[PDB]
């Protein structure tokens, strides 16, 4: 099936938005979810990672970007700040357990950061 994304928009830059990646089940603290970018034109790349509650961040977004879980919503969050231009992009979230399988993509959801 597909993870439910949600929290996407349009924002100024150095705006924030927070994405969210829901799924459905009983086992969703067993889950690693990741998120990915893809910006027009351009190859997807990965973009943040939450292993059980490690967290992991590509070098750029780190320090700007938190990811983040609530077990009992089955939910994980990126909080995104100061976001730039450079930051448009679908973001598509990933689910697996730790051997690779419960696999599962959200669809993918819009975030645009115009310049000023």
């Not at 799924?23 to 939450?50: D, H």
Request: net charge positive; charged share 20%; hydrophobic share 35%.
């Amino acid at each position: 099936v597909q993870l439910q994304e949600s929290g996407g928009g349009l924002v100024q830059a150095g705006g924030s938005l927070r994405l969210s990646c829901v799924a459905s089940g009983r086992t969703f603290s067993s889950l690693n979810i990741v998120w990915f970018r893809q910006a027009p034109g351009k190859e997807r790349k990965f973009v943040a990672a939450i292993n059980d509650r490690n967290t992991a961040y590509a070098e750029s977004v780190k320090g700007r970007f938190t990811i983040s879980r609530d077990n009992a919503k089955n939910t994980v969050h990126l909080q995104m700040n100061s976001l730039k231009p450079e930051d448009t992009a679908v973001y598509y979230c990933h689910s697996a357990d730790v051997n690779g399988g419960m696999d599962y993509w959200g669809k993918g959801t819009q975030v645009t950061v115009s310049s000023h």
